[PDB]
């Protein structure tokens, strides 16, 4: 498998192979699905919308609705303004969302389409019904990644909606970053356990992890409500979880509405979850309840009980930056070694944060790469093997070819069922991770050992 | 009626353009005129894709020993990484196979602003030096023409330097109105620059299967039956294909055309250029398969081949008859709707009816009028502005290679006999009376159909599957086959039936309502 | 592996091989740890106590405290009266539990030791300090199984503690059966989501799934409080979950205190969890809240989304009767086939209930055996294969030898970490089970398929 | 001091009895008398097991081609199903191996009331007919003697009918005071009914390893080294043993005694009956291994063997010296306590001290005064009421087979040169001054030790491990080796060290306190 990948490495400066990222717009689509009664809209040629909808369905085994401007070759000449105006008329008439959240594609960005102008023209022409909203962000696919697209859509939501009206709400805003609906639910459960009122946005819980009730609902029950999105300008503080996904929105909200913010790691593992709980306690004066303390103590109990199978284990990780930073720290906290650590998403922060934690733990000889891909990681593994691979679904080819215990993590996971109900964040999520890691490690040991070395107890 | 109930909610301008896309075929009007292959209405929630999907993702990507480089930002590459299930194996156990990789130039802002031709050149050379493939393909995406990149010239320069073929495809996503434009763009370059460049000797009883992409092993299943009868399967365009097998596509006596939409250009051009005739191939469902094998035998007109064809048919059907009986017992009386791209909405129909399942609505994303009605209408088809800039290629007889395969007496005789040589009817002309057809079906249309007809099952793709199933209706996928297959061939019927019965009889469908409601 | 197990089956009437049960006392020990500040006490030779404590620690990766009478050859001649009186004096002085819960062994049962007499003699002599309690049950190991022992200890608790004092508490008693602490937690969570006051007993949550805090506490935070055990006599109703483990206790409490009871299946899968929720709703008038209905809908959604991997799959199940009855029904609900279904615990009910659900689903050709063992199931599998094996740790040998996807379930699981944090009951537990079952089926498919049949999406 | 702090909370009766079980080694009394091998105090929370564990679970179970039938209710069998990690492989790749099974008569109420002998008879025949083992063992459990079952007679009747040996063991759980009684019961039958029944020819340089059970592969690691030097390992009692190897244990020139407690009966009886001398061996820790290998070479007194011994010791030590340095760097200065059954507390000591770790407190569950103080004290020991009824067997020299292996004058010279021939010294001798021994240590005792001494680590078993670790102190298992191994031999030192360093430097130990406290 992957027979064409050589052990001997030659420098690739141009040919990208098996990428560890995708483009902006799906990130913006995912963020928009975290608004209640929102129809995401793709302003470009319709191939984009189809593909972006499709990956969301493959990951969540759920519907993922979105509309498109359906550019033709004529837009390449007269721009996409007439297309989007026509789309809005059809959207509100056929599908009646409360809000259309527009993002762009490499096509409309290359063309220099002017969405603020088109949007004000529709407002003037009366195509946006009373009570309805149209918002936008710009999501050039040749910049950044899907994580950047999420970040941009969050900034769009604050640019159009957040307002400081003077009426304080007593709440803390939380922008959870480019995490799944189960993660969103676990973050909300922690706020609720601390007794801390909040507004989370975006929030895809109850949108992309919902029930089958026998009736299809185009706009599912979940999503942050428009009125709460407006009310984010009246909050005391914004917690931005994961700098890549969430800081741009948090900073924009600070400039627009004077709401201060605090940036925190995605809460994966012990120290990152600890920092999130502490920030909640410090910002509100609220004590940490016994239930949360008990969960942390169960994690610690588990980390110690299972320690022998984790100490010194070499791990290859690939994924999105906020999640791989936090997960790499957790790997270190488990006693294991982040050996190869890669993101497809550009940016200095990943390099600095990973290098720093590795040096703090005394770990030498790891390879860390920004804008690396799955072909890089495979070549590195061929030169020096690892004990564990953690990545999205595309890691499975490496896992089989090299016989490496494999944990699916991040986006997209398209080949297992129910993962979107399992948190990876918090003490609870950390427990699930340690169970998965130890399970795949022990499964391999027990499949491959000689019969005389087979064991009842482990 | 259904057409009026579907049209009701559309605003007037949309209502007027959409009405022609919905037709009810009946007793008195057997082949009603449909409007097809026009632009998608903005904001209507279409399932259509782009020309790049059609060229790179559909026709060209299955060529397993050619490195396919997407010239574009990363998404266009990422979204073609294994979602379409064309299967490949290393030829002779040893040849190159790139199915597990995707390749691109990963365009950045500096490429958009200053052009991407230098990065493309470097990527082509890197791919050549690392992989030494049989050929390299370069595929345009949305920004490529706009930023001024001349990929044709970059490819030609690169080919001259590295000494293997480099094929450029101008399949920018906004071209045409659907995946269909991409088929056309691919066919042009395959016909002119690949087909006919080989020098293998032709074997006896040589056929090609055109428009067949080996989704979930379909082509291997067809080949198993064809080889057992005695045919030599010269080339399959392009499922499990080597570049070299495509180069030798002219070394056959008969072209079977499975997907008419995607491959008809090459079928017509190979007939003009080489004299190789073609027939419509319908390898899905017992009736389709049997009729295809019988038509092929009539074309070769060989007593022993004909006898073997009947022996093989009888034994394949006998081996699955008990399964067929079970599917009918479990499914008869149920109703279906189908929504495919440009061909499968039609090719699966002989099969549901065999199980006693009645198909009420058939939708298509992007088929043309010639797929719905027939190829007689091509001269009556108005070229529209959004697909007029797709180049039309003209070929002439190759003086050295042209041959009369089936002389004119025999062609007439065969046509009389019911063998449609080098011609094709349509989904409509073979559908029962009453069937409603919807071109470029959208979410709104689908949901009206579901609420008004209450079908037991609605076949579609990944974007619709879960929408349909959230409503308590089974939706098996007709593109990905729900990660199974083959669905083609004799064994295909069995795999399809077994998965369908399993779907219908899943106990959880009856447990949706909680007992406190 | 297991090379001595033949395909050709010869009737075995006397030689028990690789049993699908253990003896009563550990079940009573487990029940006793579900009482706060209780020290379980093993009245017999000390080998029993050491073995029983050991299996609990191997399963839970936690401490499992218990005392023993430490019979010698002297007790075998004169009985164990002097041993248990000496034990009780040492226990209260050194370890200071609030309650000693005594069970017996095959040795003290064979000898006919008279525990009620020794206990009254201890009271008379003042060996039991005021405010402290000593209770007992009889747990002959040559009768039934560990499930029976649990059942007997629950009866002992009722016998000694439960009192109807006329002060109605407005509570429902729930006896959760021989299930793990995560299951107890999930059952409590559901009572709490429905807003129904309750008393659960026994309850090993916070006893065998506890945190590491850096201080060892002999008596963990959890366990039902003695004051609440007394108060079970003032409740409105008792729900007995799983007839084998729980009915004896529920019926005893009906005779002693007039608390009526209702028997329910262990709440695993759709219909059994539904029956539990409906019993709670019908008993109290309380509506089922949206949170529970959503969880149910997510389970249904998962069952439908994953259906293709489940339909028609042949499953071999071995375990304890209450759990295997409910799980076998869930397997049918998933569209799969309980092919070989075995418990080592004697009793008619299992045979009737499994036969009845198989008949109802039209399934013919399954083998169902009461007092069967793992050797039996292995021989059946050599004759006709299965697609899935579900059992405790000891199934791992059959799983490897026959290459069968394997789900660890029930007691004891001694070879994985953190399973005691994972419910198997309720809609949440059901989702976990589906994930595990589909994961192991898909893991095998993807390990063994030809390279050309390898898939990105599943 | 620590002894008084341990004793304080005990009630007067218990304090007076426990006091003698705790002693401190000092300069003025290097070898203090201890009270050991007495009944467990009821209710005190002991780690001790029963005589059935010592007989079936420990000594006999590892014989891999004998079917071991527990005659009892099911738990006695269930609890001996793979918890003790004696490793076995099929002899020569083909022989029988029952390691993965447990066998029982699964006694029911009817067996208790009416006797179990008919079910036992039937189980023996079923085992024989299904498995055709080398031999069958029948093991008593608590009820067996009391319900009147004469297993000795059932065994003998069965053996004559089936034609293979059937050995009965009256190891009812309440016999003796601990696992130790069970060792004795096993050794009596092994000596009288198994050893010496074979007829294989003796090989050159033949040794047995006695009281070694191949936990985690220990015996295979010692065999690797011994075979490289040139010894023939005739038998290991009983780790990875076949029944026939035990039958031929008399075909050796020297018995190595690893576990004195469990196997001393057979060592002494083999010396009496056959003339085979024994030496204490310790294959745990570099120092023990090296002294054992040097002692063995002095016994055989052969220039080639003596030279190979040094060559192999140098080569094995050089290969692991980098690791040994590492362990000492990472661990020196730390303190430990050790609590094992009857032997490992002693054998692992040379090892922790080599790493710079100081052992403060040691104990045995069930060792006798000989194990603590040396066998020199055996004249002073008198058996109490609770262990009196374990049969004491007498052997006489076998007139055909007895030989003087090492002449008496050579025996005298070896003893003067420090070789421990047919002699044993005790854990106390090589423990340093100031350190404490606790016999039959209980939970109360262990907790005082932990609170007062704050050791960095406390080695014990499964019942204590999580108790110790919940208090933030590392506890590695010295019975099961935490599912690793070997811990014996040269490779064993590296495995042990690696796991120990890994345990100490696990990051979570420092994360126990949450940041809000
Ligand atoms: S090529 Fe076409 S949409 Fe003819 S673009 Fe599409 S592998 Fe469909 S109905 Mo996916 S005209 Fe093939 C098709 Fe049919 S990708 Fe496949 S299933 S038979
Ligand atoms: S036989 Fe004994 S308790 Fe000497 S009963 Fe016990 S496999 Fe221990 S300290 Mo478990 S006298 Fe062996 C023993 Fe030592 S089971 Fe093992 S580790 S060296
Ligand atoms: S219609 Fe155009 S050719 Fe077709 S699939 Fe769309 S871009 Fe590509 Fe898009 S997915 Fe992202 S936003 Fe551009 S990089 Fe590509
Ligand atoms: S001290 Fe030892 S282990 Fe105990 S019984 Fe006695 S021989 Fe056996 Fe057996 S079945 Fe269960 S585990 Fe006991 S209560 Fe009886
Ligand atoms: Fe779903
Ligand atoms: Fe634990």
Q: Which residue's C-alpha comes closest to atom 8 of ligand 2?
A: D341
Non-local (6+) Cβ contacts of B436 within 8 A are B2, B3, B22, B23, B24, B25, B360, B361, B362
Cβ atoms of B165 and B190 within 8 Å: the answer is no
- Report CB contact under 8 Å: C303, B508: yes
Cβ atoms of B85 and B480 within 8 Å: the answer is yes
Cβ–ligand 3 distance for A45 under 6 Å, the answer yes
Distance CA A384, CA A337 (A): 13
Q: Separation of A22 CA from ligand 5 center, angstroms?
A: 23
Closest CA to C183 of C241, C251, C270, C244: C241
User: CA C389 → CA A259, B154, C6, C180, distances in Å?
Assistant: 56, 58, 19, 20
Distance CA C196, CA C216 (A): 34
Instruction: Please tell me whether residues C303 and C346 are part of one structural domain.
Output: no
Non-local (6+) Cβ contacts of C150 within 8 A are C27, C28, C30, C31, C177, C178, C245
- Can you read off the two tokens belonging to residue C343? 């418990």
- Kindly list the residues from chain C whose CB atom is less than 8 angstroms away from the CB atom of residue B87: 452-453
Which domain range does residue C432 map to?
267-312+426-458
Cβ atoms of C323 and C242 within 8 Å: the answer is yes
Q: What percent of the residues of chain A are helix, what percent strand, and what percent coil, each to the nearest 5?
A: 50, 15, 40
- Can you read off the two tokens belonging to residue B180? 């269909």
Q: Separation of D479 CA from ligand 2 center, angstroms?
A: 7
Which residue intervals of chain D bear CATH 3.40.50.1980?
A: 51-193
Cβ atoms of D443 and C65 within 8 Å: the answer is yes
User: CA B49 → CA A43, A101, B181, C248, distances in Å?
Assistant: 14, 21, 10, 65
Cβ atoms of B234 and B252 within 8 Å: the answer is yes
Q: Is C106 annotated as a binding residue?
A: yes
Q: Which of C33, C73, C143 to mutate to test the interface with D (most CBs of D within 10 A)?
A: C73
Q: How far is C59 from chain A (nearest CA, A)?
A: 9
Instruction: Please tell me whether residues A158 and A271 are part of one structural domain.
Output: no
Sign of CA dihedral D467, D468, D471, D474: negative
- Can you read off the two tokens belonging to residue D184? 């004795």
Instruction: Please tell me whether residues A44 and A143 are part of one structural domain.
Output: yes
Q: Is residue A390 part of a domain?
A: yes
User: CA B20 → CA A20, A289, B32, B178, distances in Å?
Assistant: 45, 65, 10, 18
Number of helices followed by number of strands (H, E) in chain C:
17, 14
User: B143-169: string of b/e by CB count within 10 Å (b at 16+)?
Assistant: bbbebebebbebbeebbeebebbbbbb
- Can you read off the two tokens belonging to residue D235? 């038998």
* H/E stretch holding B175: none
Q: How far apart are the first and last CA of chain C?
A: 32
Distance CA A336, CA A437 (A): 11
Cβ–ligand 4 distance for C55 under 6 Å, the answer no
Cβ atoms of D68 and D103 within 8 Å: the answer is yes
CATH number at residue C306: 1.20.89.10
User: CA D465 → CA A305, B148, C32, C46, D461, distances in Å?
Assistant: 10, 71, 21, 19, 6
Choosing from B209, B260, B262 the residue with most ligand 1 atoms within 8 A of its CB, the one to mutate for a pocket test is B262
Distance CA C205, CA C221 (A): 9
Residues in chain B: 517
Cβ atoms of A253 and A166 within 8 Å: the answer is no
Residues in chain C: 458
Q: Which of B75, B92, B141, B145 to mutate to test the interface with A (most CBs of A within 10 A)?
A: B75
Query: Judging by beta carbons within 10 Å of its beta carbon (0-12, 13-18, 19+), is residue D328 exposed, middle or buried?
Result: middle
Alpha helices in A285-395 (DSSP H): 290-305, 321-333, 348-360, 374-383
CA D190, distance to chain mean position in Å, is: 16
Looking at chain A, which residue has its C-alpha nearest residue C392? A456
Distance CA D161, CA C302 (A): 60
Instruction: Please tell me whether residues A304 and A434 are part of one structural domain.
Output: yes
User: How many Cα neighbours within 13 Å face the side chain of D24?
Assistant: 12
- Can you read off the two tokens belonging to residue C13? 């009437």
D479 secondary structure, DSSP code: S
Query: Judging by beta carbons within 10 Å of its beta carbon (0-12, 13-18, 19+), is residue C383 exposed, middle or buried?
Result: exposed
Distance CA D390, CA D380 (A): 19
* Contact exists between D and C (3 or more beta carbon pairs < 8 Å): yes
Maximum distance among all Cα pairs of chain C, rounded to whole angstroms: 80
Residues linked to residue D172 through DSSP beta bridges, in sequence order: none
B59 secondary structure, DSSP code: I
Planar angle of CA A54, A60, A62, nearest 5 degrees = 75
Distance CA C87, CA C44 (A): 12
Q: Is residue A419 part of a domain?
A: no
User: CA B494 → CA B229, B355, B459, C314, distances in Å?
Assistant: 20, 11, 17, 20
Strands (E), D230-290: 232-238, 254-257, 278-280
Query: Which residue matches tokens 């016909």?
Result: B191
Residues in chain A: 458
CATH number at residue C189: 3.40.50.1980
Q: Separation of D50 CA from ligand 4 center, angstroms?
A: 8
* Contact exists between A and B (3 or more beta carbon pairs < 8 Å): yes
Atom of ligand 4 nearest to the CA of D74: 10
Residues linked to residue C17 through DSSP beta bridges, in sequence order: D103
Distance CA D177, CA D33 (A): 20
User: How many Cα neighbours within 13 Å face the side chain of B405?
Assistant: 26
Strands (E), B292-357: 335-340
Residues linked to residue C19 through DSSP beta bridges, in sequence order: C373
**Helix B286-300, helix B303-331: angle, nearest 10:** 170
Closest CA to D425 of D225, D291, D253: D291
Instruction: Please tell me whether residues A107 and A137 are part of one structural domain.
Output: yes
DSSP-derived secondary structure for B275-302? ---EEE---SSHHHHHHHHHHHHHHHT-
Laid out side by side, the sheet with C16-17 consists of: C16-17, D103-104, D66-71, D135-140, D166-169
Cβ atoms of C318 and C377 within 8 Å: the answer is yes
Non-local (6+) Cβ contacts of A163 within 8 A are A230, A231, A233, A234, A257
Distance CA C366, CA A57 (A): 38
Q: Is residue C8 part of a domain?
A: no
Number of domains in chain A: 4
Question: CA Rg, chain C, in Å?
Answer: 23
Closest CA to C308 of A411, A9, A262, A417: A417
DSSP-derived secondary structure for A11-60? --SS-EESBS---HHHHHHHHHTTBTTEEEEEES-HHHHHHHHHHHHHHH
Question: CA Rg, chain B, in Å?
Answer: 23
DSSP-derived secondary structure for D34-60? ---S-PPPTTS------HHIIIIIIII
Cβ atoms of A66 and A42 within 8 Å: the answer is yes
**Helix A290-305, helix A181-194: angle, nearest 10:** 130
Q: Is A141 annotated as a binding residue?
A: yes
Please list the active-site residues of B.
Answer: 50, 53, 84, 183
Solved how?
X-ray
A4 secondary structure, DSSP code: T
B401 secondary structure, DSSP code: T
Instruction: Please tell me whether residues A120 and A96 are part of one structural domain.
Output: yes
The SS3 of residue B171 is coil
Closest CA to C145 of D332, D74, A435: D74
- Report CB contact under 8 Å: D463, C64: yes
DSSP-derived secondary structure for B440-505? T--HHHHHHHHHHH--SEEEB-HHHHHHHHHTT-B--BSSSGGG----SHHHHHHHHHHHHHHHHT
- Resolution, rounded to a tenth of an Å? 1.7
Distance CA D495, CA D493 (A): 6
Instruction: Please tell me whether residues C199 and C103 are part of one structural domain.
Output: no
Cβ atoms of B206 and B81 within 8 Å: the answer is no
Q: How far apart are the first and last CA of chain D?
A: 34
User: CA A48 → CA A81, A147, A351, B46, B436, distances in Å?
Assistant: 18, 17, 31, 12, 30
Cβ atoms of D218 and D166 within 8 Å: the answer is no
The SS3 of residue C224 is strand
Non-local (6+) Cβ contacts of C374 within 8 A are C17, C18, C19, C20, C318, C391, C394, C395, C397, C398
The SS3 of residue D507 is helix
Query: Judging by beta carbons within 10 Å of its beta carbon (0-12, 13-18, 19+), is residue B306 exposed, middle or buried?
Result: middle
* H/E stretch holding B363: strand B358-364
Q: Is residue C276 part of a domain?
A: yes
Distance CA B90, CA B175 (A): 34
Instruction: Please tell me whether residues C253 and C385 are part of one structural domain.
Output: no
User: D208-223: string of b/e by CB count within 10 Å (b at 16+)?
Assistant: bbbbbbbbbbbbbbbb
Cβ–ligand 4 distance for C29 under 6 Å, the answer no
The closest CB to that of B483, out of C287, C451, C457, belongs to: C457
Instruction: Please tell me whether residues A134 and A195 are part of one structural domain.
Output: no
User: CA B503 → CA B323, B328, B497, B499, D380, distances in Å?
Assistant: 16, 15, 10, 6, 82
DSSP-derived secondary structure for D176-190? SSSHHHHHHHHHHHH
The SS3 of residue A156 is helix
Non-local (6+) Cβ contacts of C200 within 8 A are C173, C174, C175, C176, C184, C187, C188, C191, C224
Distance CA B37, CA B370 (A): 10
Query: CB C168: neighbour CB atoms within 10 A?
Result: 10
Query: Which residue matches tokens 């008593």?
Result: D140
Residues linked to residue D350 through DSSP beta bridges, in sequence order: none
Distance CA D96, CA D104 (A): 19
- Can you read off the two tokens belonging to residue B281? 């191939």
- Can you read off the two tokens belonging to residue A208? 């992309």
- Can you read off the two tokens belonging to residue A162? 């957040």
Residues linked to residue A241 through DSSP beta bridges, in sequence order: A264
Cβ atoms of B404 and B195 within 8 Å: the answer is no
Q: Is residue C122 part of a domain?
A: yes
Atom of ligand 1 nearest to the CA of B345: 9
Distance CA B426, CA D196 (A): 92
Query: Which residue matches tokens 């080597």?
Result: B242
Query: Judging by beta carbons within 10 Å of its beta carbon (0-12, 13-18, 19+), is residue C260 exposed, middle or buried?
Result: exposed
Cβ atoms of C316 and C381 within 8 Å: the answer is yes
Distance CA A15, CA B68 (A): 11
User: CA B453 → CA B350, B438, B448, B510, D293, distances in Å?
Assistant: 21, 14, 8, 20, 89
Distance CA C103, CA C106 (A): 10
Closest CA to B353 of B281, B429, B436, B285: B285
Q: How far is B233 from chain C (nearest CA, A)?
A: 20
Strands (E), D85-243: 103-104, 135-140, 166-169, 206-212, 232-238
Instruction: Please tell me whether residues A339 and A431 are part of one structural domain.
Output: no
Query: Judging by beta carbons within 10 Å of its beta carbon (0-12, 13-18, 19+), is residue A98 exposed, middle or buried?
Result: middle
Cβ atoms of A99 and A38 within 8 Å: the answer is yes
Specify the pairing of strand B103-104 against strand A16-17.
antiparallel
The SS3 of residue C359 is helix
Closest CA to A265 of A330, A215, A312, A194: A330
Boundary of a domain, candidates A112, A143, A162? A162
* H/E stretch holding B166: strand B166-169
Residues linked to residue B460 through DSSP beta bridges, in sequence order: B477
User: How many Cα neighbours within 13 Å face the side chain of D220?
Assistant: 12
Instruction: Please tell me whether residues A171 and A154 are part of one structural domain.
Output: no
Q: Is residue A343 part of a domain?
A: yes
Cβ–ligand 1 distance for B217 under 6 Å, the answer no
Q: How far is C167 from chain B (nearest CA, A)?
A: 32
Fold for D51-193, please state it: Rossmann fold (3.40.50)
Residues in chain D: 517
Instruction: Please tell me whether residues C157 and C172 are part of one structural domain.
Output: no
Q: Is residue A1 part of a domain?
A: no
Query: CB A34: neighbour CB atoms within 10 A?
Result: 28
């Amino acid at each position: 498998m992957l027979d064409a990948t050589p052990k001997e490495i030659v420098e690739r400066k141009a040919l990208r192979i098996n990428p560890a990222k995708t483009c902006q717009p799906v990130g913006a689509m995912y963020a928009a699905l975290g608004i209640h009664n929102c129809l995401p809209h793709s302003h470009g040629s319709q191939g984009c919308c189809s593909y972006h909808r499709t990956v969301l369905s493959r990951h969540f085994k759920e519907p993922a609705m979105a509309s498109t401007s359906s550019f033709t070759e004529g837009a390449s000449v007269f721009g996409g303004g007439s297309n989007i105006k026509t789309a809005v008329k059809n959207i509100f008439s056929l599908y009646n969302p409360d809000i259309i959240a527009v993002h762009t594609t490499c096509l409309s960005e290359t063309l220099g389409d002017d969405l603020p102008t088109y949007i004000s023209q529709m407002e003037d022409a009366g195509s946006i019904p009373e009570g309805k909203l149209v918002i936008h962000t710009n999501t050039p696919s040749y910049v950044g990644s899907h994580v950047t697209g999420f970040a941009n859509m969050v900034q769009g939501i604050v640019n159009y909606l957040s307002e400081n009206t003077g009426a304080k709400n007593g709440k803390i805003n939380v922008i959870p970053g480019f995490v799944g609906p189960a993660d969103m639910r676990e973050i909300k459960r922690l706020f609720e356990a601390m007794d801390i009122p909040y507004i989370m946005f975006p929030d895809t819980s109850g949108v992309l992890d919902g029930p089958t009730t026998g009736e299809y609902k185009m706009y599912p029950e979940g999503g942050t409500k428009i009125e709460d999105l407006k009310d984010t300008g009246n909050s005391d503080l914004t917690l931005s979880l994961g700098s890549y996904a969430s800081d741009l929105g948090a900073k924009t909200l600070e400039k627009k509405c004077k709401v201060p913010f605090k940036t925190l790691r995605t809460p994966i593992g012990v120290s990152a979850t600890d920092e999130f709980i502490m920030a909640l306690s410090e910002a509100t004066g609220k004590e940490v309840p016994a239930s949360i303390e008990e969960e942390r103590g169960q994690l610690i109990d588990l980390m110690i009980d299972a320690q022998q199978y984790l100490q010194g284990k070499k791990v290859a990780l690939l994924g999105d930056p906020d999640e791989i930073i936090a997960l790499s720290k957790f790997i270190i906290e488990l006693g294991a070694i982040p050996k190869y650590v890669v993101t497809g998403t550009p940016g200095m922060k990943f390099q600095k944060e990973i290098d720093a934690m590795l040096a703090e733990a005394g770990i030498e000889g790891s390879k860390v790469k920004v804008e690396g891909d799955f072909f890089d990681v495979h070549q590195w593994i061929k030169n020096e093997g690892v004990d564990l691979l953690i990545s999205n679904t595309y890691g499975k080819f490496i896992a089989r070819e090299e016989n490496i215990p494999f944990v699916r993590f991040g986006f997209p996971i398209m080949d297992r069922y129910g993962h979107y109900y399992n948190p990876k964040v918090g003490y609870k999520g950390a427990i699930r991770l340690v169970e998965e890691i130890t399970n795949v490690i022990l499964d391999k040991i027990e499949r491959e050992c000689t019969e005389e070395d087979f064991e009842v107890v482990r | 009626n259904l057409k009026d109930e579907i049209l009701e909610k559309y605003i007037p301008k949309t209502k007027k353009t959409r009405s022609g896309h919905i037709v009810i075929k009946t007793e008195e009007t057997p082949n009603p005129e449909i409007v097809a292959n026009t632009r998608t209405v903005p904001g209507i929630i279409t399932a259509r894709g782009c020309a790049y999907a059609g060229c790179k993702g559909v026709v060209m990507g299955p060529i397993k020993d050619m490195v396919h480089i997407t010239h574009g930002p990363i998404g266009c590459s990422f979204y073609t990484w294994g979602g379409r299930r064309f299967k490949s194996k290393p030829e002779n156990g040893t040849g190159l196979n790139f199915n597990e990789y995707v390749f691109s130039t990963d365009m950045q802002e500096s490429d958009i602003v200053f052009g991407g031709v230098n990065k493309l050149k470097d990527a082509i050379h890197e791919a050549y030096e690392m992989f030494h493939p049989a050929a390299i393909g370069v595929y345009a995406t949305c920004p490529v023409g706009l930023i001024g990149d001349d990929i044709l010239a970059v490819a030609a320069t690169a080919s001259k330097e590295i000494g293997i073929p480099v094929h450029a495809f101008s399949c920018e996503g906004y071209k045409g109105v659907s995946q269909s434009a991409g088929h056309h763009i691919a066919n042009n370059t395959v016909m002119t620059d690949i087909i006919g460049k080989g020098n293998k000797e032709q074997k006896k009883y040589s056929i090609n299967v055109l428009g067949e992409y080996n989704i979930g092993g379909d082509a291997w299943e067809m080949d198993r039956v064809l080889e057992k009868i005695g045919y030599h399967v010269n080339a399959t365009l392009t499922g499990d294909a080597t570049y070299e097998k495509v180069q030798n596509a002219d070394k056959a006596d008969l072209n079977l055309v499975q997907c008419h939409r995607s491959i008809n250009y090459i079928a017509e051009m190979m007939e003009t250029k080489y004299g190789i005739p073609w027939i419509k191939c319908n390898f899905i469902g017992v009736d389709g398969i049997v009729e295809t094998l019988r038509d092929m035998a009539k074309c070769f007109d060989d007593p022993e081949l004909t006898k073997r064809t009947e022996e093989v048919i009888a034994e394949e059907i006998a081996a699955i008859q008990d399964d067929l009986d079970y599917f009918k017992e479990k499914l008869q009386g149920k109703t279906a709707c189908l929504y495919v791209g440009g061909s499968r909405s039609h090719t699966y129909m002989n099969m549901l009816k065999s199980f006693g399942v009645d198909s009420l609505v058939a939708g298509f994303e992007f088929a043309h009028r010639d797929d719905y009605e027939g190829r007689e209408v091509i001269p009556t088809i108005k070229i529209d502005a959004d697909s007029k800039n797709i180049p039309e290629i003209t070929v002439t007889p190759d003086e050295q290679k042209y041959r009369v395969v089936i002389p004119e007496d025999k062609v007439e005789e065969l046509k009389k006999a019911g063998v449609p040589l080098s011609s094709y009817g349509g989904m409509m002309k073979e559908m029962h009376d009453g069937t409603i057809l919807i071109d470029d079906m959208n979410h709104h249309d689908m949901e009206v159909v579901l609420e008004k007809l209450k079908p037991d099952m609605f076949f579609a793709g990944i974007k619709e599957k879960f929408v349909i199933q959230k409503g308590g209706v089974l939706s098996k996928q007709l593109h990905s086959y729900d990660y199974n297959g083959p669905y083609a061939g004799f064994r295909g019927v069995v795999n399809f039936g077994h998965e369908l019965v399993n779907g219908i009889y899943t106990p959880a469908w009856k447990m949706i309502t909680p007992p406190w409601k």
